[PDB]
Point group: C3
Chain length 249, copies 3
Amino acid sequence: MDIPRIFTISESEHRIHNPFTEEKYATLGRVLRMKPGTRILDLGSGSGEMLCTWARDHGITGTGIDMSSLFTAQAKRRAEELGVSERVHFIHNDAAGYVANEKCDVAACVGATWIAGGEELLAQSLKPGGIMLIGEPYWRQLPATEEIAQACGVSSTSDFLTLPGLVGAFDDLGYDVVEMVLADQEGWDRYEAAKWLTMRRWLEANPDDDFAAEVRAELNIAPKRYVTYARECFGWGVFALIARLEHHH
Amino acid sequence: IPRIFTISESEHRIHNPFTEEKYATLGRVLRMKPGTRILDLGSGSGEMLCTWARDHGITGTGIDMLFTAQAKRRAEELGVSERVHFIYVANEKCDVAACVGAGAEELLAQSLKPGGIMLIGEPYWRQLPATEEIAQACGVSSTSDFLTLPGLVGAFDDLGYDVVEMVLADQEGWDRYEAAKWLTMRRWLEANPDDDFAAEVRAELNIAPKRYVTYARECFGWGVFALIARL
Amino acid sequence: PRIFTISESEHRIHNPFTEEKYATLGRVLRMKPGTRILDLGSGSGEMLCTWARDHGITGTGIDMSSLFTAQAKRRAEELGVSERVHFIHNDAAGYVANEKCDVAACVGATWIAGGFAGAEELLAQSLKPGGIMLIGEPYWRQLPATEEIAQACGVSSTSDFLTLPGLVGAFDDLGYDVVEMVLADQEGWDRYEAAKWLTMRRWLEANPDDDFAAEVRAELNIAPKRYVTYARECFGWGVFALIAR
C-alpha cells in the first residue's frame, strides 16, 4: 500500500506538502507565544523546517521524528546551516515505538499529506495543559452534493468534516482549542498549481517512459478539476489544542 | 465594559481585525508626508499613530481613555517619543482626523481642516447573516445593526464625502484577532482559577471558538475608509 | 480613454496584482538567470524590472503610453538593473520580437489583441518552442445573473469574460497546458481601485481647469460605489502560465 506514483511524481519539487506557506508556519510559532526553551515534539518533521526555523526565531528546543527518508541528515544539516543544531534534534524513527525522556510543551503533527490526519503518543509525551498542534483537512465550503464531492476526489461529503464541525469535534473530545491558523486560496494555489508544472517537466524529462500516459492524463485534468470544484471546497489548517484536564478537588 | 473584553484582548496588539501589515498599508496608501497631523478618536491600542510616526515621520495625538496606558508604551519603545501623544474637539483642525474602532461624522468634522482626509473604522456585513438568529449568535442584536459593504459606502457618499481610499480586513485578519482571544482566556483561567468571574470566562472560551467558526467567520466585516468632503 | 491615464498615473502595477503576487509569479515560474522575456503592454515595467533584479532575467517591454515607458525606464534605473531590461515606446497590437523568447507575456493589456484568444496568436509568434506564455486575463469570479448586473460592473455583457473553469478550459481548447497560475485576491483589487479614487481626487484639486475635469469628477462620483456594489464580488483576475502541447 505504497504511495501512488502520480503523487510522488507531481510533488518532487514541493518544499511544503500542504497549503501552508512559509509565512503561515512563521505565524504559527508566533501566535503560540512560546517562551525560549519551550521543548517541542514534532511527529512527521519531514524537512525539519518548522522545528529549525522556530528554533532560531523563538529560540526553542525540539526533536523531530521523521518517517519519510532513510537518512535525515538533510534536516540535521539544516539545523547546522541555521546555527541551531544544539537545540533541535532529529531521529529517523517511524511514529510508534517511541518514548520521550521528558514531557514537552508543544506536540505537533501536521500529517504527511494534507488529506490524512495521522493521538496517544502526542498525549503521552505532553505536559499537563500542553498545546497539541494538529494539521487537519476540512470543507471550506460544504459541497452541495456527493456529485461535486466525488469530483473533488472524495467518496462522500461525510469523509471530511466542515470547519465548524471540526471545532465541534475537538470540543466533544475534551479538547480546548486555543489557536487556529487556516490556509487561504493563495496557499492552496501555490500547492496545487506547483504540480502542473512539475508534471509537465517530468514529461519533457522522460518521454520514453510508458508512464507518461498516466502523467499526461493527470495533467490534462489537474487544473480543470481544481478550479472547477476543489479550489472552493477543500480547506486545511493547523489547530492548537489544549485538553481539558480534571484536577485534585 | 465587560471585563471579558479586557481579558480576551488582554495582550492584543491591535484591538480589531486589522493586522500589523494592514495598518502599514493604510499609511502608505494614504500617500501622506512629513508634517501631517492626526487625531485618533478611539486610539485604542495606539499602534496606528506610533507605527506611522516611525515609518512616516508624522505628528498627531490619540484619544481614548485604560488602553491609553498601553498605547503610551509603544511611543517610548519605538524611538518616536512625543511625535504623537495619548489621553471631543481639537483647536488645531488636524490635517487628518480618524475614528478607528456612521454618525461619528459630526465629531471628526469639528476637528478637521478643509479638504482634509477623514479615516473611519467601521464594521459591516461582509455577508448578510442567513437568518436573524444567526446574526444574534454572531453576537449582534439584529441584522439591522450593521450595513452591507456597498450600503456603507453609499452612506458616506450621501453624506457629502467621497471615498478616496479604503483598506478592509480579510479572514486571515479576523482569525488572528479572534483566535488569539481564546489562548489569552485559557491562560487567564490557569492563572486565576480560584478567583471570581472565572466560571464565566470558562463559559466564554467554551463557546467563543464554536461561535466564531460557525457564524462570525463569514459575516463579520471591518475596515477603515478614508474620506474627503466634497462641495 | 484618458480617464485611465489620469487615475493610474501613480500606480506602480496596473492590475489587481500586488508586489507580492508579482514576486510569486516570477518565483513559481522557476526561471534561470538569463531567460529572455517579452512583455506586451508592460505598463510601468514593474514586472520586468523586479524579476530582472531577483532572477537575473532579461527582456523588453512595449507600451503605448510614453508616461509609463518613462516610469519603467526610471524604475529599472532605480533598481539598478536597466542593463537587463529594455523598454520601448510602441504599439503591441502587432508586435513581434526579432528573436524568439523563453517567455512571451501580455499581462493585463490583453485588449490590445482583442480579448485573449487573439493574444495567443501574438505572443506565440515570438516564443521559443515549449516556451512559457504568461496571460493576465480577468474572469467572472462570480458570474452575474443578469446583463444588468454585468452592465453595472463596468462591462458590456456576461459573454465578455469567462469563469475560472471556463477560462482554463479555454486555454486548453487552444492546445495549451496551464502549468502555473497566480490568481489575484479581493485585497489586490482594493489597492488597485482605491488608488484611482485618490489619484483622481488629487488630480481634480490640481487641475480644476483641464478639459477632462468634468468627466473625471463624474467618474469619481460613482467609482467607489460601482466597485463595492458589484465588481468586487463578480470579478476575478490572474496570470496563467501556458505552454503549447
